[model samples]
Target: SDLDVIRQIEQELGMQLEPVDKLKWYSKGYKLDKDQRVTAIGLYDCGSDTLDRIIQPLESLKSLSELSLSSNQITDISPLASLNSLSMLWLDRNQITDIAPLASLNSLSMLWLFGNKISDIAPLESLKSLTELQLSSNQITDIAPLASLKSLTELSLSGNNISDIAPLESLKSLTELSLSSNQITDIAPLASLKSLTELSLSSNQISDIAPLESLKSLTELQLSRNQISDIAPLESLKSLTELQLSSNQITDIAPLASLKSLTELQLSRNQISDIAPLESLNSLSKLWLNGNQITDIAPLASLNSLTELELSSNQITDIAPLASLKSLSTLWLSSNQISDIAPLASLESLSELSLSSNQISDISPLASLNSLTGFDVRRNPIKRLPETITGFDMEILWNDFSSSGFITFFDNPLESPPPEIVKQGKEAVRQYFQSIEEAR
Candidate 1:
């Protein structure tokens, strides 16, 4: 039965098996058809089974539309070099680092070589059909070799030590890219990706995002974990949906109201003082505003579809507006001035609650709520919780009573810590947005 083969793989992978047609990395010698003409294949994370024993069988394969050997122990892909039927190939996460073995696959349209030791892609100049390529997470420094592949529709060079991505201008078909966790300081070449719908540059040393203004087709973008401080140029990206600017120096969110397509936004660990911009985004469903200076959320009455909200470490004293939101399901009001839940007596949809680190002296108002399950009010001044707290999986914010919190930062001579915080927050939000796009 089809269920039997899938069950075997699921038990081996320790995860649920996807739909039969959906692609995934499979273990070697997992009973694949030998004579049948397969279209695509992914052979990664096969529980340490070596690809050396299966290389002969894989080479005999024909008419493959996709092939993935990522994270495999095989270092030689010379067997599949001349197979003109292959359209997509993933060779990432392996010890093999040579592009010379893959130069002959003329029909290959996409190639992934991330998480390897490859230093150069000069041999891939002959893959004329290549449209999408991922060469990130490697040791190569220069991308001058990829000037020949003009059909690239998407490219991900993230996780690599790449200091220069200037050679990517020749890939005119590029529509999506990930350059996060690299050493790139200038992104002037990205301006040429006019068709790009998504781009990520998180965890880099970039200080500016002005180079991406010309990429008008970009509907989603991430710039988290960088040194960027300005977000004025982002008003041009009207097609954006998800945005992440967490863990930065952002003090104000006045510029984000212009982005109407955003359904999710992250502004955690910043210096925000207002909740005004959130009122304009009526389509928002998920919002992360933790670790900020927000005092109130009265403006959230307009976003009726908001399902997830995080307001931890803020100055919020009242949560009356949250009761008005009919679609609210989760709320995080930890480390705030919230002292009452009488307004939530009539509210029905909230399932998860975090009220840790507050001055609450009582929880008598939440004793009869049947829709509650998870709750947290740890590290607050309260020594005991209400009797209703037992119905939910409530945990304190801190683990022990003997330790204090600390935050060490670089003291810049030119800019104050608040300004730097704002700058850093914008980048975090941008990176979070990119991560969501990848998972989607």
Candidate 2:
């Protein structure tokens, strides 16, 4: 009889089911007890008209602890008020506007309502057992009711219109909070959240970060796309492992020398002209300094742990210091003033290299790099090809040279190849060098 009741419930919710023996094996929308009685149902991303279909039948699932109705078209949840045992509920990316029915579900601990149209959160002020809540990309503006939720550990309110974060000051147990893409300017309210370990306040109007100095437990902080010009306050947070300060007006990185535990640092699209402070960060494995005014990279020679380095769109003229970085597998130096790539000859660990839009004339030094699989030399005035080329997957040779004679020179100033042989592909160019070597 329980099977028929579940079958009737599935039809009511506009879902198809199999026989009773096989229906018990479905994990998405079915959870059966030991006696083959359905105790839970999860309907996800399926076409449904309304929650009125199976809202009343969910009362029989007294043992249901998890319910996922994400990415559906349900607008009413008045049927879930009696499901008191539900601990986790995911209703994200739906068309619901009213959550007054969920006010009585006090047993809920984790709830996600992302991509919804709900604006008022007054109904959630009573359910204090929540630990993780994701309300990102929604129309929520007022979060004053969340201050009482002392049990919340992780919360994301990104893409909302809340400008004043003063209401979230009481959530001392929060470890991770994201308020990105908001109009917040004053962050003094967050200074009391000493328990926070990770915080993201990106894309706001914050210029002064002096309020964050007291949250010393932070390990990951994202303040990108703000108007912050000073980062002296973050020097005391020595526990940082990842820091994103990209797209700001930061011209000096001297404040970051004390963060010795950093493993990833992103300072791209800033006004930094000097990188002398980064030499002390020996623990950094990934560093991005693209879109800046850096000219000399000699200080990076000591950072032997760096595996990925981005210095694109800078004013670097000499990259000789990069030869010592043998652990590098990916290096981007495009749109720079580098003319000589002789320094990269010893970097045999490189797998992907980009030297586009440079003045490099001779590429004979790159042939020694045996591990190169992807090479881009486009827009460079390369005069000739290497004698032997192997282990390359994608290689773009000089395609912008105006004269054919420019591509025939094999490191010698006046050496020329036969006109007929130069027209033949890169293999013909390789033989031209062989003919000259044999004559000598």
Candidate 3:
């Protein structure tokens, strides 16, 4: 009568049933509840034996709402004609070759037949209420039958053998769509979805993202690892929070400044040299400026909310701009021209800091940071580390700032460490008459 009965019957019948959760129930008006009932059903992967068993269940239960019988070894789903309460169905990842049985589900709101032998969605026009549909990752090269599904709000033909998305222009209410990892070169069809909030055209032959300018309501956009050399259209997304443009030919980030709401930006492995525009983003929290041509981080001092900063493989002469960042916990200045550690005195909140491969003569700055549990000042010109952890069982990678790295240990000291660690330790006070020895 309830879930207990379903579980017991499923165990006895050797049939496993898993319902769709709220994450996949892409309904614009669907209320999110922890527990919801199923009214329709799907018969997926139905090899003749599974179809025979499913027919018996369908004969008894005529109240199913939504069903996904995918990946169950089935051939066809024409036997569920008796149950008329069906609203949504998923027959993807199957071997079905026809769109005939689907025409009977008049109340259907969503249907997924991706990864199937079927070549057309011709018979699906009977389902007038159908709102969401997917026929991706299939052998079909064209998506023409989808035109009759005018009420469609979400459609996916991604990962298909198709070369064009020109057939999708009829879909107007679509808000979120994905066509990633496809042969789609021209995205002129997506320009009509004015209500689109999220678009993913990544991992494609898309060199230009100019067609997406009309979808201004977009919040999350991912075009990473693409041949997109033009980012001018993305600047108009005023509501964007996350943008990933990694591994592209992006030379200038001036277009990114227009995105005032951007919080997380990843511009790694690009030819970007200027960071002047990033300082204005006061809401930015996590920034990845590594693998670029940025030579300065002084502008980052204004970003009080910044928690993580990466400045590796850059041409930096000094580390003064970072000293005032009292809120920064992770500062990466690896591979730069920093020769001093005095500026690090202000970064007392630093937990994990790396200053590898620089000429650091005096490492006394490590002694003052009580919050620093581990530091990697390795492969730098720094001579020694503080004897006492007045910090902790501190782990300092003291592989002397040479092209080749090395680690040395210092223990069992004769004197106590100072309240504030500096290059001047206790031994400097005892050594007297040392002035004449230096001149001779």
Candidate 4:
């Protein structure tokens, strides 16, 4: 009997029912109430329909607390103004330019209106109880109206054209704020938000981070792809554990040496050559230094807690320093000057190893690795490998090599059977290498 309301919404919205004949949460999604009355409707991404079509059947659900009609062609939402009991609403990716209807909903605490055509959020000044507000990817210019919403804890205004964040200085309760991909250069206003633990100001033109020095309570900070060259201001922010500074003009990492609490650091696509400072950071577990001018990795030998390391497209030749890192499971050393991979023999915890695009002629060092599930050794000078190499899982490697027919040996200059015989399956290639060893 409660299924009729779902069928009725489908009848009005111009779509078929979701076949809720064998689902427990069906009523909870479209209709939620012990009294069997329609209180919640989620017709999101069902099909394109006008706002008039959605308002006709939903008028009966006066007790509606949650409604999601995102990713649709609905423009106007004047019909939902009377939904006083609504606490959460999701109208993301819609054509709605005005949200005047939501101003009267005093119970609304969480609202997501991302990817909309909204420029003026003047109507949202009345939603004082809102705890989380996401209005990213919109045409909003002035955010002065949001200063009155002191109850907000998380606010995302990214992908907008607002530059002056002076209006958000009064929101002292904000713990998380993302203003990425904007035209803001001056962040002097954000220094007052001490309660912020997570702040993302990436893809902006801000070069001066001196203003962010006061935000000592921050744990996660993303300032990637900006004009920031001097990160000396970040030295005082000791509470940070995760920091992103990729695609900037940073060469000297002497500023990050004191951040011993850092566990994850991303400094890719820079001009860093000296990683001697990272040796003292014992808490680092994940580090990305790809696309830099690093030639020697001897400094990384002390970072034993590292589990994932990316050093691709560097000028590294000797990998002897990485031998001590036994905890590494995923290592990418592609497009380097490495000729010998003998140092990687002791990495027993390796499950995925990429040594492609190097001058590796012998893979005899890989015989000890038995726990490998994904291995990539393409574009190397590997001519011979032991049939039992790891001697661990031959069938598993050959099964994929045979089916694909384009094994890692496709471009290699092997002596026996050549590339043609190697494609015959893993056994042909393994036996070919075995025969060579027997001849000696």
- Residue by residue across 12-31, what tens digits does model 2's lDDT show? 76566433322221134666
Give Cα-based local distance difference scores for all models.
Answer: 0.69, 0.80, 0.67, 0.81
Rank by lDDT (best first) = 4, 2, 1, 3
The C-alpha stretches of model 4 lying farther than 4 A from their native spots are 1-28, 31-39, 54-57, 389-411, 434-440
Best by lDDT: 4
Model 3 C-alpha lDDT per residue in residues 217-282, reported as the tens digit of each score? 888787877777778888788888878887788887788878888888878778888788777788
lDDT of 4 by residue, 303-352 (tens): 99999999988999999999998899888888899999899998978766
Worst 10 residues of 4 by lDDT: 398-407
User: Global CA lDDT of candidate 3, please?
Assistant: 0.67
lDDT for 213 in candidate 4 is 88
**lDDT at residue 220 of model 1 (Cα atoms):** 74
Candidate 1: tens digits of C-alpha lDDT, residues 327-434: 777887877888776776655787666666776655656666566655554544453333333333332222322112211112112122232332344343345445
Error at 410, model 3, angstroms: 17
